[PDB]
């Protein structure tokens, strides 16, 4: 593992997906920054302390609240302004452009878009206005908006099986929605009783469409099975401050990764979550780790120390 310092606090880091049938491991990643007068979306490649090459960047107005790859060349960003944008990478001349955008995806006046997930051609967003949008590439207006879906702040979203999704909010509720539904109420609510601890992140198990992991204000990892009643299947003590992201490893989901405000990034190894050894990967002097992404043996993360940490050799 190694660090690179990049002169901006990094809110989001995502690997570019690999071409179908590639035998190579991930080498290109996107970042989004926050807390600057000028924030940026940036694309980077790793050469074979590493050597990083800035491929291109583009000014992003607002803090980058979330970021996902839609396909090889398209990157979707959520702004603190409530704008949702699809950026397009042009590899021939290494430029970024705006492909399409929904400037009023979230609003009250401006309301931050807090989460975006992609399942090409669909894009789903949530925000502090408690609005949930389904967008489709090249459609100017939302396919569906669930106005005033949640009365609490929506912090994150995941697909279950499209057009079904699950959201997490600031009072610790998981809510399940379908864009075909009538009304503004969820089909199912799950939550831990006692303290209504805010949930900041959620990820669906890549193979088991019924299973999700969440991270909370209290640093805890929760595993849920939406067929198994309203409480989590597992509740595990973890970080000393907020957990900002949680990711199952895409190809071997016995491995799961979490990062926190307390400056740690954990690799959890259950090799099943229904039904554990943990390694902390960053040094003891880290500021908030805001974001991580994992693909194959490659991990990238971004911190409030204006640092990106990478390993391309997680398992070797």
């Amino acid at each position: 593992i190694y660090a690179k310092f990049v002169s901006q606090k990094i809110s989001k880091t995502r690997w570019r997906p690999l071409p179908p049938g590639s035998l190579q491991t991930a080498e290109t990643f996107a970042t989004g920054s926050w807390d600057n007068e000028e924030n940026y979306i940036s694309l980077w490649s790793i050469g074979d302390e590493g050597d990083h090459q800035l491929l291109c960047d583009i000014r992003h107005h607002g803090d980058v609240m979330d970021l996902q790859f839609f396909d090889q060349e398209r990157i979707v960003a959520a702004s603190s302004t409530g704008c949702v944008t699809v950026f397009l990478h042009h590899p021939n001349n290494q430029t970024l452009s705006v492909n399409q955008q929904w400037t009023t995806a979230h609003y009250h006046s401006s309301a931050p878009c807090t989460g975006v997930v992609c399942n090409n051609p669909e894009i789903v967003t949530v925000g502090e206005d408690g609005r949930i949008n389904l967008f489709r590439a090249d459609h100017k207006e939302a396919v569906r908006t669930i106005d005033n879906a949640d009365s609490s702040t929506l912090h994150a979203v995941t697909f279950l099986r499209t057009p079904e999704i699950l959201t997490v909010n600031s009072i610790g509720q998981l809510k399940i929605w379908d864009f075909r539904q009538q009304g503004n109420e969820p089909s199912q609510i799950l939550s831990l009783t006692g303290d209504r601890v805010p949930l900041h992140c959620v990820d669906r198990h890549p193979n088991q469409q019924h299973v999700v992991a969440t991270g909370g204000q209290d640093g805890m990892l929760s595993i849920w099975d939406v067929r198994q009643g309203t409480m989590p299947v597992s509740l595990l003590k973890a970080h000393e401050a907020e957990m900002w992201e949680v990711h199952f490893h895409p190809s071997n989901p016995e491995h799961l990764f979490t990062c926190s405000e307390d400056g740690s990034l954990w690799h959890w190894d259950a090799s099943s979550w229904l039904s554990i050894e943990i390694t902390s990967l960053l040094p003891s002097r880290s500021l908030s780790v805001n974001t991580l992404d994992v693909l194959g043996p490659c991990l990238v993360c971004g911190t409030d120390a204006e640092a990106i940490y990478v390993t391309r050799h997680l398992f070797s």
């Binding site: 279950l160 099986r161 469409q209 019924h210 067929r227």
Partner: protein, 307 residues
Amino acid sequence: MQPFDSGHDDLVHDVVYDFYGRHVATCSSDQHIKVFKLDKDTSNWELSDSWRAHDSSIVAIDWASPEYGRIIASASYDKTVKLWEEDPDQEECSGRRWNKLCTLNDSKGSLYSVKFAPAHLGLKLACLGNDGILRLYDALEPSDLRSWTLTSEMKVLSIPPANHLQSDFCLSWCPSRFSPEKLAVSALEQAIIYQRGKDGKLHVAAKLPGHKSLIRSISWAPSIGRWYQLIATGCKDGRIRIFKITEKLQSNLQVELLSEHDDHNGEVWSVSWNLTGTILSSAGDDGKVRLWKATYSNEFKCMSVIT
């Protein structure tokens, strides 16, 4: 995988799997046909649709090859055979998810069985009833799933006495893709095989001797890998029988008896095969299901007993 209710009021006669094994069709005496779906997420079986389809007890059912669409066929004591096609533009459980595509009234006696033919022969099917006459039907133009013509009629039994509740008939095509068209038929104590001739007509090419009572079930096994054919029968005399048929009184077909099994001690009601014809199943009075595998010597051995 816990049991579940079918939703039928009267006794259930047949259950059949679709090609992918993710769907199931049920038919009962309450004159209904139910279709169940195997939900991906929650590995549970859940009713896709139910509907009234006949004026009398529905005894047999079967799915057509997926390369012809979503098609089910039913046979009832009301002397008819009906064909249905799923209309994906309808809500599940609405009772209107399967549209009748046709009705076959040619039979003048109740019907006991109906089986689609192997896909490599087009939409084809067979049926047999009290009239003791096997009938083959063909959907000549695969576009018109209503254009059901009658391809053939054969007299299986010759003199069925007008006073017997004791009646049973079964059908089973040879699944084999690289073997001349042929199918097996059971009628009471008898069991005979038909084969397509050069003249495009069915001829009796052999008989499966040995049954000393009523044949409750028969099924042709998938001959993937083998050069021979295998058909099993569950008789009322309490014996499972497995016949080896090779093609090298006017036949080109040989008939060996490979196995006999009375392990059930009572009538063997159901006999079924693997998708690879690697496993054979049997069920009967003893309230037990037995799975059979073939030995290296080609004998058959019971690899497990469910109850």
